[PDB]
Design an enzyme around this catalytic site. Structure first.
Site, PDB file in Angstrom:
ATOM      1  N   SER D   2     -31.114  17.590  39.291  1.00 30.39           N
ATOM      2  CA  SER D   2     -31.999  16.462  39.029  1.00 30.39           C
ATOM      3  C   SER D   2     -32.600  16.005  40.351  1.00 30.39           C
ATOM      4  O   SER D   2     -31.864  15.705  41.296  1.00 30.39           O
ATOM      5  CB  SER D   2     -31.248  15.317  38.354  1.00 30.39           C
ATOM      6  N   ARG D   3     -33.934  15.948  40.413  1.00 26.44           N
ATOM      7  CA  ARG D   3     -34.609  15.707  41.686  1.00 26.44           C
ATOM      8  C   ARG D   3     -34.372  14.291  42.192  1.00 26.44           C
ATOM      9  O   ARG D   3     -34.318  14.060  43.405  1.00 26.44           O
ATOM     10  CB  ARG D   3     -36.107  15.969  41.548  1.00 26.44           C
ATOM     11  N   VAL D   4     -34.249  13.325  41.280  1.00 23.16           N
ATOM     12  CA  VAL D   4     -34.057  11.938  41.693  1.00 23.16           C
ATOM     13  C   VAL D   4     -32.720  11.770  42.403  1.00 23.16           C
ATOM     14  O   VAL D   4     -32.633  11.132  43.459  1.00 23.16           O
ATOM     15  CB  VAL D   4     -34.182  10.996  40.482  1.00 23.16           C
TER      16      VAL D   4
END
Lengths: 247, 260, 131, 72
Positions: D2-4
C-alpha cells in the site's frame, strides 16, 4: 518528459550549472508512447510498445548529456513490468542507464535510510580509471565485505557471533559497521526526526570507509556509526557514548 | 514449484546445520565423561601394568566370528551417505566371507536395517535404531546387546562401521574394532591406522572466509598418574571388569553421535 | 562440610552438586562416605547412589559405572543415572514386572547376561518405590 | 503493498499494526521452517507459533465487519 527536459536544458545552456532531472518512472513514458502509437494506428512492435521505441526513448534520454556549458545529469526511476530485464522497454532503457541503484524495501523497514541497497546497486562509473584506484579498491572491498555478511546472515543464526572463526568475526563486525555507516541523516529528514543533516564529500566517505575496513576502528560500537556524517563525527559519537557509559 | 523447492531446501539446510551443531554440543557434553574415563583408565594401567587375569571383553585370541555392526543414517534422501556406508559394509562382509568368519551384523540405522531385512544372504540379526540424539538408554541397549554377545565367546573381533567426521563435503566411512577394547586404552582401527586414546578428535564447525566447514580439534587431555596415596577399594581385576563396559558404551555413544 | 560431587554420564552431568553423605554401592559393599574421605577408587555397580544432603536422603538410581573418589572432589563415571524423582513409582514397578517377564526367556550364556541386565533394570525400578 | 503506508492508520493501529506487520514478515520468512522446526531455538519456535496464531487472527468470517474498536 520532454517538457521537463527542455526546462532543464535552458538551465544547463543558459546558466552553465549542473541540473538534475528527476524523470519519474520511464516505463510510464514508454507506456504513453505505446498508447499514442496504438492511437495513431502505427503497427505495434515487440511486446506492445511502439515501433519507434528505441528512437523515442533515445530522443528523451540523449539530451541528457554533459555539454561543455554544464552537466544535465538526470535521475530516472525505472519500473520493469513483470520484473524482467529482457523485454524491450527495460532493455532499451538499461541500454542507456549509466548507474543503477535499487532502493530496498527490507532495508527501508529496518531503518538504514537511505534504503539504497549497497550490494545489488551497480554503476558503470565504478571502474578504477573513472573513480580512482583507491576508490575502486575500497568500493570492491566494501562490496565483498557486504557479500560476506549477506552470506553469513544464514550462519550467525545457527553458530552465533562467537563460535565462528575470529578471522571473519572481524569481517562481520566491520560489515555491521559499514551497513550502519552507509546510513546518512539528510537535510530533508529534519522535519521528521530532528537530526541536523550532514553532507558527506567523496573524499571524506572514502577515508572513512578506508579507516573502517582497514582495521583501526574495530573497537567503536556498532550504533556509533548509525546516522552519522564524516568518520570523525562517528568517533565523536562513540566518545560521547564512552562519556555516558559510566552513567 | 521451483521457488518453493528452493525455500524448502534452504530451510532444510538451515535445520540440518542447527542439528549438526546440536550433535556437536552433545559431543562436547560427553567430552568431560570421555576425558575422565580415558584418564582413570590410564591410572588403572599405571597402578597395575596390565597385570590381569580377568575381563572376558579381551578375548582377541582368534578372529573366529566377527560381528560387524554398521550404523547408518536414517531419513530420506540421506545425502550420498547410506549408500557409501552399506557399500563399505558389503565389501567388508565379502572379505569376511573369504576368510570364512560367519559374520553377524548389528544394524543401528533405520534405513540401513530396512535395507538389510531385504537380503539375508548377509547374516543380519538384532538390529535397533536411535535418531536425532543418541539417548543413553538406547546406548545402554546396544551396549547390553553387544556385551552379552561378547561374554559368550561366539562373538569375537567385534568391529563397527561408523563414518568419522573428517570433513563436511564428504566424510569417508571408517571401520573400528571395538570389543577387544585394548585395556591399555587404545581403541584402534583396522590394523594400519591404530590410534592412541587421550588423543581424541573433537570436531568444531566454524566458518571459513565464507562457507561452513568442520575444523578438527585433536586436543590432548593430560592424565594424572595417581593421587598421592591412591588406596584401592575393589580387587585389581574387578575394577577393569566393571570399567571396560562403560568404556565400550562411551565408544558406542561417540560412534553414534559422530555418525549422526 | 561437603564434597564436590560430579556424577557423570556419557552425554550428561546428572547431579552436579555438593553432598554431605554418599552411599554408593560397590560390588563388595555399600561403602558410606563422609566429607574429607581418603583417596580411593570404587567400582560402583548396580545400586542406588543414596545421598543424604541437608534436605533429605534424596536417592538417585544409577545403572552401572565407576567412581574415582578423591578428597572432597568425587567424580563418578556412571553409565545411566536418574537423580531425584526423574523416575516415578507406578510405571517403574510395572516395568519391573515386565523385566520379570523378560528374565525367564531362553538361550544359555548369550541371552542370560541380557536377562541379568534386565534384572538390573528391575533394580533401577525398585528405587522408585523408595520415594 | 500500500503506497500510503501507516500515514492512513489511526494512532492505535500506528502502534499495534507495526508489530503486526513486523511479526507477519518474520513469520513469512519462517514459513519455510513451518513443519521442520524440530526443537529448534526458542526464539524461532515462539516466533513461528505466534505467527501461526497471527494468521488465524487474520482470517475472519464471511461478511463479518470488525469495527476498529474490536480489531485493535
Amino acid at each position: 518528459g520532454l517538457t521537463a527536459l527542455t526546462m532543464a536544458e535552458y538551465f544547463r545552456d543558459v546558466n552553465e550549472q549542473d541540473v538534475l532531472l528527476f524523470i519519474d518512472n520511464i516505463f510510464r513514458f514508454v507506456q504513453a508512447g505505446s498508447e499514442v502509437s496504438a492511437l495513431l494506428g502505427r503497427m505495434p512492435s515487440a511486446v506492445g510498445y511502439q515501433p519507434t521505441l528505441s528512437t523515442e526513448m533515445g530522443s528523451l534520454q540523449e539530451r541528457i548529456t554533459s555539454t561543455k556549458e554544464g552537466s544535465i545529469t538526470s535521475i530516472q526511476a525505472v519500473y520493469v513490468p513483470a520484473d524482467d530485464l529482457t523485454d524491450p522497454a527495460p532493455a532499451t532503457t538499461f541500454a542507456h542507464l549509466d548507474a543503477t541503484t535499487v532502493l530496498s524495501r527490507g532495508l527501508a523497514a529496518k531503518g538504514i535510510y537511505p534504503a539504497v541497497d549497497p550490494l545489488d546497486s551497480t554503476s558503470t562509473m565504478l571502474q578504477p580509471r573513472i573513480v580512482g584506484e583507491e576508490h575502486y579498491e575500497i568500493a570492491q572491498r566494501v562490496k565483498e565485505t557486504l557479500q560476506r555478511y549477506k552470506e553469513l546472515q544464514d550462519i550467525i543464526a545457527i553458530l552465533g557471533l562467537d563460535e565462528l572463526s575470529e578471522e571473519d568475526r572481524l569481517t562481520v563486525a566491520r560489515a555491521r559497521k559499514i551497513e550502519r555507516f552507509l546510513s546518512q541523516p539528510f537535510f530533508v529528514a529534519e522535519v521528521f526526526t530532528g537530526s541536523p543533516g550532514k553532507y558527506v564529500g567523496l573524499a571524506e566517505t572514502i577515508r572513512g570507509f578506508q579507516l573502517i575496513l582497514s582495521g583501526e576502528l574495530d573497537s567503536l560500537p556498532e550504533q556509533a556509526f548509525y546516522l552519522v556524517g564524516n568518520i570523525d563525527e562517528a568517533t565523536a559519537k562513540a566518545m560521547n557514548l564512552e562519556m555516558e557509559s559510566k552513567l | 514449484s521451483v521457488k518453493n523447492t528452493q525455500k524448502i531446501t534452504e530451510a532444510m539446510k538451515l535445520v540440518a546445520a542447527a542439528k549438526v551443531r546440536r550433535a556437536q554440543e552433545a559431543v562436547v557434553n560427553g567430552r568431560p565423561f570421555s576425558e575422565t574415563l580415558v584418564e582413570v583408565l590410564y591410572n588403572m594401567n599405571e597402578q597395575l601394568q596390565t597385570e590381569d587375569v580377568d575381563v572376558p571383553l579381551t578375548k582377541i585370541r582368534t578372529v573366529k566370528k566377527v560381528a560387524l555392526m554398521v550404523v547408518t543414517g536414517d531419513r530420506g534422501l540421506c545425502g550420498g551417505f547410506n549408500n557409501m556406508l552399506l557399500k563399505k559394509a558389503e565389501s567388508r562382509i565379502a572379505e569376511l566371507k573369504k576368510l570364512g568368519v560367519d559374520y553377524t551384523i548389528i544394524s543401528i540405522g533405520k534405513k540401513g536395517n530396512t535395507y538389510f531385512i531385504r537380503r539375508p544372504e548377509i547374516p543380519v540379526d538384532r538390529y535397533f535404531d536411535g535418531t536425532n540424539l543418541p539417548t543413553a538408554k538406547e546406548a545402554q541397549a546396544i551396549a547390553d546387546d553387544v556385551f552379552s554377545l561378547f561374554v559368550s565367546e561366539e562373538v569375537d573381533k567385534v568391529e563397527m562401521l561408523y563414518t568419522k567426521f573428517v570433513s563436511l563435503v564428504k566424510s569417508d566411512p571408517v571401520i573400528h574394532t571395538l570389543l577387544p577394547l585394548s585395556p591399555k586404552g587404545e581403541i584402534c582401527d583396522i590394523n594400519g591406522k591404530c590410534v592412541d586414546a587421550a588423543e581424541d578428535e573433537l570436531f568444531r564447525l566454524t566458518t571459513k572466509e565464507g562457507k561452513l566447514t568442520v575444523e578438527r580439534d585433536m586436543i590432548k587431555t593430560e592424565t594424572p598418574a595417581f593421587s598421592p596415596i591412591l588406596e584401592f577399594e575393589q580387587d585389581p581385576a574387578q575394577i577393569l571388569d566393571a570399567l571396560l563396559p562403560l568404556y565400550l558404551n562411551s565408544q558406542i555413544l561417540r560412534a553414534l553421535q559422530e555418525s549422526l | 562440610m561437603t564434597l564436590n560431587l560430579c556424577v557423570l554420564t556419557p552425554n550428561r552431568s546428572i547431579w552436579n552438586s555438593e553432598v554431605k553423605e554418599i552411599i554408593l554401592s560397590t560390588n563388595s559393599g555399600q561403602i558410606g562416605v563422609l566429607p574429607n574421605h581418603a583417596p580411593t577408587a570404587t567400582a560402583v555397580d548396580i545400586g542406588i547412589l543414596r545421598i543424604r544432603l541437608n534436605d533429605q536422603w534424596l536417592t538417585l538410581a544409577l545403572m552401572g559405572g565407576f567412581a574415582r573418589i578423591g578428597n572432597n572432589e568425587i567424580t563418578i563415571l556412571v553409565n545411566d543415572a536418574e537423580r531425584g524423582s526423574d523416575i516415578d513409582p507406578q510405571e517403574a514397578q510395572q516395568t519391573l514386572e515386565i523385566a520379570e517377564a523378560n528374565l525367564r526367556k531362553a538361550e544359555g550364556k548369550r541371552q542370560k547376561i541380557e536377562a541379568n541386565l534386565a534384572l538390573r533394570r528391575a533394580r533401577t525400578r525398585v528405587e522408585a518405590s523408595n520415594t | 503493498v500500500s503506497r500510503v503506508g501507516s500515514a492512513a492508520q489511526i494512532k492505535a493501529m500506528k502502534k499495534v499494526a507495526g508489530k503486526l506487520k513486523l511479526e507477519l514478515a518474520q513469520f513469512a520468512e519462517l514459513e519455510a521452517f513451518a513443519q521442520f522446526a524440530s526443537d529448534l531455538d526458542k526464539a524461532t519456535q515462539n516466533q513461528l507459533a505466534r505467527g501461526q496464531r497471527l494468521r488465524e487472527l487474520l482470517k475472519q468470517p464471511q461478511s463479518a465487519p470488525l469495527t476498529v474498536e474490536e480489531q485493535v
